[PDB]
Amino acid sequence: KIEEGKLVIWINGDKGYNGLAEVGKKFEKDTGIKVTVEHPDKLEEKFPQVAATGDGPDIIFWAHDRFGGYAQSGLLAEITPDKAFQDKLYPFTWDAVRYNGKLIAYPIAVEALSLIYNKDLLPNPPKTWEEIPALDKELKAKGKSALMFNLQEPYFTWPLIAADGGYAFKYENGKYDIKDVGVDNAGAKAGLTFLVDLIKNKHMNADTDYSIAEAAFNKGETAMTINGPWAWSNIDTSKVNYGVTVLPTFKGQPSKPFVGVLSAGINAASPNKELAKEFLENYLLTDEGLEAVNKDKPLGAVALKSYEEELAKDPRRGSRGIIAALGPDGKPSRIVVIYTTGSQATMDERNRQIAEIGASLIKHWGSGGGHPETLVKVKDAEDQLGARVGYIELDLNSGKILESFRPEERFPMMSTFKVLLCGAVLSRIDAGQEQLGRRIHYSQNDLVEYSPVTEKHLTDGMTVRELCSAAITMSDNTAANLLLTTIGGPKELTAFLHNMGDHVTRLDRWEPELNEAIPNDERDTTMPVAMATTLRKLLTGELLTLASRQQLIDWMEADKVAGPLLRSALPSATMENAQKGEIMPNIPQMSAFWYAVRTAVINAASGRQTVDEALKDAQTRITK
Ligand SMILES: [Zn+2]
Ligand SMILES: [Zn+2]
């Protein structure tokens, strides 16, 4: 059935098939094997048909989502690359091509929508979705519009719908639960409501599809569009002075686009599995291989770290203190605490220094922790910032201090107290005294400075779960106060810590007053060693349940990713949108998702159905 002795490749017409062919000639010269590149019609639908009969191409290129439907039947082969190669790619790209611990494909490129804006019409793009209506009113006066994108398809509309808590299918442990769908939740409804209101207020049109949006932006008629790298060439051709940036926020939370991982899967019926893995590992997944493909058709962002760093260069309220659990894709094994002080340093300077300590930590991981170089970088941090730095690196399992610097001096906790706060919250949940979905209502007066999520939920309210997430990940100050009120205030948090053996850490004040940090003021302070030990008691033992531990870990993970610690260690517009987005579920049940959600959006857009009933009907359709 399948030719013995040569490689046949199936890649889509929109992708750089001619660029992959040049890599095919680079392999042909070195080995002496005829590399064929074919682009047939409906290749993602033809592959289930051909591979089932013991036939088909050796290597298939497609987004990872359909690849789950091949691993179920048995059409894809297991992938065995060494860590010497698995390190060269991003840790999340592999988790997109995993089915039951197995590896079914090599990740090549990452696809995610981004905000594209005309620099001539709009030099400074909006940071939030909420400011777009008033910006559209500004631009209509000049015969232009603010934003035009494909409203017909769920994929283009999802980033906004999912932003405030929407999801396709729940991912827990590793398996996607086909019964837990989040297209019906309050977050999804708020998201769709905003879109519908944009349509109702005539900032957008219900008829706008892919070609109407693309032509309107490329002709300079609209200031913004929403698209992926597959559209970049048409804009280059159009000669519009354009930038690509992070999608706007909605209710203080990032837009949540679907993440496609263009992947190269090896056919299970193929007799050339080893011959294909050589071409993919040693030829394609190199700087030179990706170069040829990216030249033919821009891939956007790539799976190979060395080449993404090069592409990221293309021109087209922070943390004084930090707390992090590292080695996280598997159970975290280390706690890091760092505090910076003084009124001299800018946040960019603070962030730069924290990143350098982070970069130093990852460099010497698995070496046993506490490498002399990292202590040098910490001392260098105190130096450059012109004020005391506190630091501790702790092994989560042993409780052993791997490194310390000013471990027993007091430092203002500031935003780091919020993890301890939500630790107390989850403790009341475990006991039956609290529910993560209990909604809390509040007024304008409750709002303090630096409250990006809470200030957009005045009419809606917020669940305890949303408050903890906003407090930790978005550092929402009002959120922390509202959570403090639930447990009884700063004295109760202090009482909670003393009851679990931490007699150092103290919270005395509310937000924003707890942030002021008067020199040597002992209010709202901790020690690096106190904080790390307390964090350890919360993340090990029986102080929280497994479910609560995992949730505390998951809040901290998003905080660590959004923060400075990992910036210089593992650093694009496509990539940054993908990092805050949703990995597209690799199940055939996704077909039911696409059908129902498309119907829901066109019905809510037209006024055929209300937003509530349109998404209820969609939810019913999925879980049927
Ligand atoms: Zn919300
Ligand atoms: Zn005490």
Describe this structure in words.
- GO terms for molecular function: carbohydrate transmembrane transporter activity; maltose binding.
- Keywords: Periplasm, Signal, Sugar transport, Transport.
- It is found in: Periplasm.
- By secondary structure, this protein is α+β, with helices and mostly antiparallel strands.
- It folds into 3 domains: 188 residues, Periplasmic binding protein-like II (D-Maltodextrin-Binding Protein, domain 2); 185 residues, Periplasmic binding protein-like II (D-Maltodextrin-Binding Protein, domain 2, 3-Layer(aba) Sandwich), CATH 3.40.190.10; 251 residues, 3-Layer(aba) Sandwich (Beta-lactamase), CATH 3.40.710.
- Helices cover 42% and strands 17% of the residues.
- It has 24 helices and 25 strands.
- Strands 1, 2, 3, 6, 15, 16 and 25 form a 7-stranded mixed beta sheet that branches. A 4-stranded mixed beta sheet has the order 8-11-7-12. It has a 4-stranded antiparallel beta sheet with strand order 17-18-19-20, with helices on both faces.
- Strand 13 and strand 14 form a beta hairpin.
- The longest helix is centred in the middle third of the chain and has 17 residues.
- The site of one zinc ion (ZN) has 8 residues, from loops.
- One zinc ion (ZN) binds next to loops.
Tell me the layout of helices and strands.
Blueprint (H helix, E strand, L loop, with lengths): L7 E3 L6 H15 L4 E3 L4 H9 L7 E5 H10 L9 H4 L4 H4 L3 E2 L2 E2 L1 E7 L2 E5 L13 H9 L4 E3 L6 H9 L4 E6 L2 E8 L3 H15 L9 H9 L3 E6 L4 H7 L3 E4 L3 E2 L2 E2 L3 E9 L6 H12 L2 H10 L4 E2 L2 H7 L9 E6 L7 E7 L6 H17 L8 H14 L3 E7 L5 E5 L5 E2 L4 H14 L8 E2 L21 E2 H10 L3 H11 L2 H10 L25 E2 L1 H12 L6 H17 L10 H7 L2 E2 L6 H17 L4 H12 L2
Parallel strand pairs: 1-2, 1-3, 8-11, 15-25
Antiparallel strand pairs: 3-15, 4-5, 6-15, 6-16, 7-11, 7-12, 9-10, 13-14, 17-18, 18-19, 19-20, 21-24, 22-23
